[PDB]
Amino acid sequence: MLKYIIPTIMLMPLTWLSKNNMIWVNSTAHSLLISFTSLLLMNQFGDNSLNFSLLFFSDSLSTPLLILTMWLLPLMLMASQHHLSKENLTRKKLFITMLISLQLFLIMTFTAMELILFYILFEATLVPTLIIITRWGNQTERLNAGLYFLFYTLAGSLPLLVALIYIQNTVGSLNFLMLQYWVQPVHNSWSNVFMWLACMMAFMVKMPLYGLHLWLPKAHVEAPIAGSMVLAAVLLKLGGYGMLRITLILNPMTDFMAYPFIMLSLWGMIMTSSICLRQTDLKSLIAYSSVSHMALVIVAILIQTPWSYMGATALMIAHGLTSSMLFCLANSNYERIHSRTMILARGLQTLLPLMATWWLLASLTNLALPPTINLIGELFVVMSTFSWSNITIILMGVNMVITALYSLYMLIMTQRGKYTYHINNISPSFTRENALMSLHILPLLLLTLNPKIILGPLY
Amino acid sequence: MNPIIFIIILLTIMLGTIIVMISSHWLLVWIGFEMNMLAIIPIMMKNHNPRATEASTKYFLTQSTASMLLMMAVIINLMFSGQWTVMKLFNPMASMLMTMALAMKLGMAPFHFWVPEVTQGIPLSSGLILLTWQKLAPMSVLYQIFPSINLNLILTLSVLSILIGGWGGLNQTQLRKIMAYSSIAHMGWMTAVLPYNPTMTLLNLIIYIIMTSTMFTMFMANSTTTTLSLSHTWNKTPIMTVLILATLLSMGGLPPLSGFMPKWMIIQEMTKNNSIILPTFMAITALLNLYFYMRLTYSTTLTMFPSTNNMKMKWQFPLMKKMTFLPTMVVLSTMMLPLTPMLSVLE
Amino acid sequence: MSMVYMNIMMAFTVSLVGLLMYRSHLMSSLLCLEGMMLSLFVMAALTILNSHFTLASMMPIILLVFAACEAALGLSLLVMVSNTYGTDYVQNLNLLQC
Amino acid sequence: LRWQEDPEPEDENLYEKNPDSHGYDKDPAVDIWNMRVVFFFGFSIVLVLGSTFVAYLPDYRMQEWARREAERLVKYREAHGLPIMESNCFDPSKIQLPE
Amino acid sequence: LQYGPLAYILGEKATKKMTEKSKLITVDGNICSGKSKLAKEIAEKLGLKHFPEAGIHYVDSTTGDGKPLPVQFSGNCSLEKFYDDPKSNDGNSYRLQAWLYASRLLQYADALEHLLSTGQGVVLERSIYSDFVFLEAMYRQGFIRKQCVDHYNQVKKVTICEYLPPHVVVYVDVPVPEVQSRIQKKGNPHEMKITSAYLQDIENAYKGTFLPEMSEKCEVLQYSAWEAQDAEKVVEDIEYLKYDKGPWLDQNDRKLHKLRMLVQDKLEVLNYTSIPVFLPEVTVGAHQSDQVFQEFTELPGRKYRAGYNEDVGDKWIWLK
Amino acid sequence: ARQWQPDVEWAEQYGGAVMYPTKETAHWKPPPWNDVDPP
Ligand SMILES: CCCCCCCCCCCC(=O)OC[C@H](COP(=O)(O)OCC[N+](C)(C)C)OC(=O)CCCCCCCCCCC
Ligand SMILES: Nc1nc2c(ncn2[C@H]2C[C@H](O)[C@@H](COP(=O)(O)OP(=O)(O)OP(=O)(O)O)O2)c(=O)[nH]1
Ligand SMILES: [Mg+2]
Ligand SMILES: [Zn+2]
Numbered sequence A: 001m002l003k004y005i006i007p008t009i010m011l012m013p014l015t016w017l018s019k020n021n022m023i024w025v026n027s028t029a030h031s032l033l034i035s036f037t038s039l040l041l042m043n044q045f046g047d048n049s050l051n052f053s054l055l056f057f058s059d060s061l062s063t064p065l066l067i068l069t070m071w072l073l074p075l076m077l078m079a080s081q082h083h084l085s086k087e088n089l090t091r092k093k094l095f096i097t098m099l100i101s102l103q104l105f106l107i108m109t110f111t112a113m114e115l116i117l118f119y120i121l122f123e124a125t126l127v128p129t130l131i132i133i134t135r136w137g138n139q140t141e142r143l144n145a146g147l148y149f150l151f152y153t154l155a156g157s158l159p160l161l162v163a164l165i166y167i168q169n170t171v172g173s174l175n176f177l178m179l180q181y182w183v184q185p186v187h188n189s190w191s192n193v194f195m196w197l198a199c200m201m202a203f204m205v206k207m208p209l210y211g212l213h214l215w216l217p218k219a220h221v222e223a224p225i226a227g228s229m230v231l232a233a234v235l236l237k238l239g240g241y242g243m244l245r246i247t248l249i250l251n252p253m254t255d256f257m258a259y260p261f262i263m264l265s266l267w268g269m270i271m272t273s274s275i276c277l278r279q280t281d282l283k284s285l286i287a288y289s290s291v292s293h294m295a296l297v298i299v300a301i302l303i304q305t306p307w308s309y310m311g312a313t314a315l316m317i318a319h320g321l322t323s324s325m326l327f328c329l330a331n332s333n334y335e336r337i338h339s340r341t342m343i344l345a346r347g348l349q350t351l352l353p354l355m356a357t358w359w360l361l362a363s364l365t366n367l368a369l370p371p372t373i374n375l376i377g378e379l380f381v382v383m384s385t386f387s388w389s390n391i392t393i394i395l396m397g398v399n400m401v402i403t404a405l406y407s408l409y410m411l412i413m414t415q416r417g418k419y420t421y422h423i424n425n426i427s428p429s430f431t432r433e434n435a436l437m438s439l440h441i442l443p444l445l446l447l448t449l450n451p452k453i454i455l456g457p458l459y
Numbered sequence B: 001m002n003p004i005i006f007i008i009i010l011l012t013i014m015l016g017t018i019i020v021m022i023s024s025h026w027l028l029v030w031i032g033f034e035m036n037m038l039a040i041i042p043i044m045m046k047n048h049n050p051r052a053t054e055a056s057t058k059y060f061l062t063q064s065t066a067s068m069l070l071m072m073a074v075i076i077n078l079m080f081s082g083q084w085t086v087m088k089l090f091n092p093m094a095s096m097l098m099t100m101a102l103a104m105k106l107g108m109a110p111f112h113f114w115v116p117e118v119t120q121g122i123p124l125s126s127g128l129i130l131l132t133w134q135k136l137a138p139m140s141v142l143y144q145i146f147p148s149i150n151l152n153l154i155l156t157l158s159v160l161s162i163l164i165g166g167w168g169g170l171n172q173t174q175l176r177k178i179m180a181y182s183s184i185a186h187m188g189w190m191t192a193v194l195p196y197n198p199t200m201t202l203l204n205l206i207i208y209i210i211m212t213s214t215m216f217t218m219f220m221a222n223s224t225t226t227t228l229s230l231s232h233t234w235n236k237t238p239i240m241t242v243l244i245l246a247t248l249l250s251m252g253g254l255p256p257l258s259g260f261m262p263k264w265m266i267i268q269e270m271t272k273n274n275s276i277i278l279p280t281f282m283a284i285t286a287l288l289n290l291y292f293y294m295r296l297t298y299s300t301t302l303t304m305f306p307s308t309n310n311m312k313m314k315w316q317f318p319l320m321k322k323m324t325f326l327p328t329m330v331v332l333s334t335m336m337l338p339l340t341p342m343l344s345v346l347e
Numbered sequence C: 001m002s003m004v005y006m007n008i009m010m011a012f013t014v015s016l017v018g019l020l021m022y023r024s025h026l027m028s029s030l031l032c033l034e035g036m037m038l039s040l041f042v043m044a045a046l047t048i049l050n051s052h053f054t055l056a057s058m059m060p061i062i063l064l065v066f067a068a069c070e071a072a073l074g075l076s077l078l079v080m081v082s083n084t085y086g087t088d089y090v091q092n093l094n095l096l097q098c
Numbered sequence D: 001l002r003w004q005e006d007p008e009p010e011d012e013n014l015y016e017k018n019p020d021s022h023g024y025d026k027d028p029a030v031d032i033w034n035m036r037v038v039f040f041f042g043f044s045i046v047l048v049l050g051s052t053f054v055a056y057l058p059d060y061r062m063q064e065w066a067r068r069e070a071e072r073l074v075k076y077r078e079a080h081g082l083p084i085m086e087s088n089c090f091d092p093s094k095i096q097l098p099e
Numbered sequence E: 001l002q003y004g005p006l007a008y009i010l011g012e013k014a015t016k017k018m019t020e021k022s023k024l025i026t027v028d029g030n031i032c033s034g035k036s037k038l039a040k041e042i043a044e045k046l047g048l049k050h051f052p053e054a055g056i057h058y059v060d061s062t063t064g065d066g067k068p069l070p071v072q073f074s075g076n077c078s079l080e081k082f083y084d085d086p087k088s089n090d091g092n093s094y095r096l097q098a099w100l101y102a103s104r105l106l107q108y109a110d111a112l113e114h115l116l117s118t119g120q121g122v123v124l125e126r127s128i129y130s131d132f133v134f135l136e137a138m139y140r141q142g143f144i145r146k147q148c149v150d151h152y153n154q155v156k157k158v159t160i161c162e163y164l165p166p167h168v169v170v171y172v173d174v175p176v177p178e179v180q181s182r183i184q185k186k187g188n189p190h191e192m193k194i195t196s197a198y199l200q201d202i203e204n205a206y207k208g209t210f211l212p213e214m215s216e217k218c219e220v221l222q223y224s225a226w227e228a229q230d231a232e233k234v235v236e237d238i239e240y241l242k243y244d245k246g247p248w249l250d251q252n253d254r255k256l257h258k259l260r261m262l263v264q265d266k267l268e269v270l271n272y273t274s275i276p277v278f279l280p281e282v283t284v285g286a287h288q289s290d291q292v293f294q295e296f297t298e299l300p301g302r303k304y305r306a307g308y309n310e311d312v313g314d315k316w317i318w319l320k
Numbered sequence F: 001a002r003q004w005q006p007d008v009e010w011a012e013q014y015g016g017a018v019m020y021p022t023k024e025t026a027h028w029k030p031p032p033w034n035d036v037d038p039p
Helices: A002-017 A023-042 A062-079 A089-109 A115-124 A126-135 A141-171 A176-182 A190-204 A215-222 A225-249 A259-278 A282-303 A306-337 A353-366 A373-388 A392-415 A431-446 B003-022 B026-038 B050-081 B092-106 B114-120 B124-148 B151-170 B175-193 B198-222 B238-251 B260-272 B277-285 B287-302 B326-332 B337-346 C003-019 C026-050 C055-085 D030-055 D060-078 E005-010 E035-046 E079-084 E092-118 E133-140 E146-159 E176-186 E196-214 E231-239 E253-263 E286-298 F008-012
Strands: E024-029 E122-125 E168-172 E219-223
Touching (some): A023 A089, A062 A225, A062 A306, A062 D030, A089 A115, A089 A126, A089 A225, A115 A126, A115 A141, A115 A225, A126 A141, A141 B287, A176 A225, A215 A225, A215 A282, A306 A353, A306 A373, A353 A431, A373 A392, A431 D030, B003 B026, B026 B050, B026 B124, B050 C003, B050 C055, B124 B175, B151 B175, B151 B287, B175 B198, B175 B260, B198 B238, B238 B287, B260 B337, B277 B287, C003 C026, C026 C055, E024 E092, E035 E168, E035 E231, E092 E253, E133 E146, E168 E196, E176 E196
Parallel strands (some): E024 E168
């Protein structure tokens, strides 16, 4: 994995040693070249994973999350060029440094073969993420957002640290490959109940689980555009990736310990979807959409079937491109009107004809229109949960209705109707804005043709 | 104070600590504690103001009372064993007084009320010695007598130090008091692992000394002693605020920084000994320390607090402060995690 | 141990409780501190002399020297307190609460 | 006023001083090279060549081989009197059940 | 060899380079009192270095290339605008006085550094000990709010307590009516608007507060306007002064070492002139200060430490 | 919309004797700037 780690580190010298007026050009160009080379990780075999060394490996679960990660960095640099326009050069090159350092921790996190190496980099992503939110947020609530985003994660991460070390002293190794052959069943005792929670609550908070989600509406809303894109596109999937790995060593206790977290997800799925029907902030509405969508991933991971895992992986990748796209679309409006209220600028389809097409395509994937990978992932989870309990179709069907209501309501409150009269600064769509959306949707739509590469290790 | 006398006094503080470390006789250990205290009071009085006088008086009474208890433990040990070797004490009552005398010297809770006040009333340079070098000698004795220490007593002192250290620092706007309560909080970690693996006590001590030295050096570089005064550093020396952010984040125990190494290693040792509740409580309780560090980051680096007009007159002069080893200490305080297996040199 | 140890060891306790309960005067507390060292001197002297520990006979003198040298420092701080507030009252040493 | 502070600046429209602005930068020369790298490395390399590369992956996850292997076994085990598939993945001769 | 603990040990004591003719002298008086000429005459007669009265750009004259910097890197405080609109709500009234005290404080550290390092005396004009006369005049005329006076005292009482006072104070007494007569003849368009009440208050501050307090620790010489024209007579009195009162008699090498370590570190001198006291006159918003700081760093020979600027012909940067 | 930065009201919350005022902590003046109390 050094072939991707070293180039990522060399972007930092590139930014600092580049011309004062070429920081964006050089970083964007060379970050796209790193993304292009990540396609070599798809050399996957049907029996064994691609094991590079004692430290790093990449299987069919890590590969799609790596390509989305390295592909997201170029798109975050395009989105940041506007609000970082009157910023002094040194701080602009520090902002890019934080983004690069975040990618470096992420790709190593998704390939760490050792679960304690996974933990360190897993926690290492908080530092740059916190710095981006609090130093380059526009509102006074960004300072409070960082505290919520920091202490919610650490409140659950520290118990995970103890549990991981306890496992090593018992099994003898936290290397993932070894655990696949040395895993022993978990007895039903009170000690193992809290070992289960410690190993899982660190990831429930990041997914996030309903009830433990109050940090997301504060962090995703106060963060700059680049922070929101990575926050909702990759950093939420850090929790999902964690469960898919650590649930290996929690059987058969996951059969009953998952009930409280399936009801929070199945019901919290409906609640957060309902919240989006009455949100007065466009960015906040998208934040609550991630909570509703990630509720499916928790259910799929906790029922442990070949179809649930296939759906969860496609859902995590599908939501990553969609959620990032929606934040970018919402920011283009903000860059003009400079206000997050959803009912302030209406009828935008009359002033920005092309940007309205992106809104439609973004909304359709959000509501899982087939054959998009948004539907493929959601459909597979629905098939698996039906076999888990036939009554769940009621809850996951009601969520479909609500998801279509708030997604098209978002598309109708901003793009249709009557244009606001007193807003006269809605300039045409820049090439930067249009190209930013095309990069989100084209790969999202292209994956439909060959979707087996995002179906995970159980394909 | 004449420079030559200042050097001689400083060397006497070190000689006092060194005698405690190299001595195999309790009387010589007690002598080192007396010499060390004798030569640290003068540097606390160097500024000759009422607050410095009060701080020295409180410091003298606490150490003096601790010293008497330490000599009482040695004599009781002598009665029941007839020897002075610096090893496990041979009477449980001697062990309690020795353990409690060392707690008072270290400032561990509930023998902590003096640390926030003594540190406040003395300059930053004096406070740096009090919080970093003064813990080498008491920790040396614990490293040698830990087999005979009562397990419940040492963990009770360690737990209360973490709680009171975390809670005390929340209500502080004076930096010297913030460091004073951060010293107490980190002390609990050192003495909490001591029964299980003394080596991790040394590892935590070294890391704490390096990080605490960096913060005091950076506070001294700008002569800042309050939260608001530190809030102008962005408008005077912008580079310094970035260093403070990295060090404060490290002191909070966040990965991938150096400060995570002692917390990470102490949990391992306690978990190997089937101690799961205490490390979890300690790790969670340390989030209080991470909080009031993060509150200094906001007021220093992550936000630009209001400035004053005369600050422009400071842009026309450079920093003449010595800032000795500051470039090296900051790196050791933030980028040493990939070298964690190097802790075996302490074994 | 012996009947003498009951009182010498109890003398240390009395002076210890006296040192931990200030009334008004800082001088009255340094005396209690000096009381502790006198009881330690007598208790250490008895143990060493009774057991015929020849080389330890110098230990009580070293204890007296360093303890007295500590009192000389304690008196210097009491004097400087008096020069500030005109009295050795400990209730005046409360500027460091805030 | 409680302090001496600058007035809030107003956002500058990049279409005023440059109607051909692509929105990437104020400099008309940089603004045109930022667009090219995004469009050449984004749409012409990662997508067009990446999409082709993913299209011709050499038998991803050994799936086409498995189909060709099963046809071989079906030919063998079907025209030899053997069952098409067994209910035991491992022969009982190697297992030793309890008691 | 930069002066420090090592140089003092090696032999750089203050008394080894100070004589009976190494004195610090301040010439004080009202506006247009002739102190400039009198001070510049005592300087040349006794062989003493002359420090022109610190102004708004004194600090700019001791750093960089010595030329005055643009006004925005001085707080935007202008002496000219003070006379035109003393009641301006922006805060130029006090923002000037707070800045001027810093410059006087900075100069008094420059003066003592010269005296303690070379042994040569200095002659000053309105040292920090006498800058409060303009404070009282501004306040008694309703030119500054009460809190501004409180802010001035807080800054003064933590800075003026570190330095020694002047050896000799020469006060050029002038009646107020004559002073205002000289203002008109001088020809300054803005200074002519100075009212008589403002000038009378300055005299009361001198006669009521400065002189009575200064006489207990300095050798005070009082001269009318006419007497001040006989520079030889004034210098004669200075050479006959007893020098028996004041803190300067208690100073030795050990104490003068500690003082020198302070006045040479100009940031340690200016440390308490920016106390975190939020007063609208002197408080500056983060956005404004951030913008000005970046501009200041772009001026010639100021981006890096003095001596490392390649854009002003400083060489060997790769070996310094 | 410019980025919000702390103002005097926000800053003064960190310039008191204590962060959390109570009945007892009232009347606590902040320490002197240079650590010297009047003689
Ligand atoms: C080996 C493990 C690592 C040790 C760490 C390195 C040493 C500490 C750093 C240097 C300290 C230092 O020099 O002290 C501070 C000052 C430094 O002189 P300055 O004027 O500030 O600068 C001058 C140089 N410049 C400006 C060019 C940079 O020196 C002294 O006061 C010197 C005192 C010497 C006499 C001591 C008295 C007699 C002692 C014996 C009594 C029994
Ligand atoms: N606000 C304020 N103005 C001052 C201060 N010192 C001088 N000024 C102003 C008053 C005058 O307008 C100008 C110079 O006044 P002077 O005292 O130096 O008298 P003048 O220059 O006219 O002639 P002279 O030197 O006395 O012979 O600077 C001060 O401390 N505060
Ligand atoms: Mg003049
Ligand atoms: Zn904008």
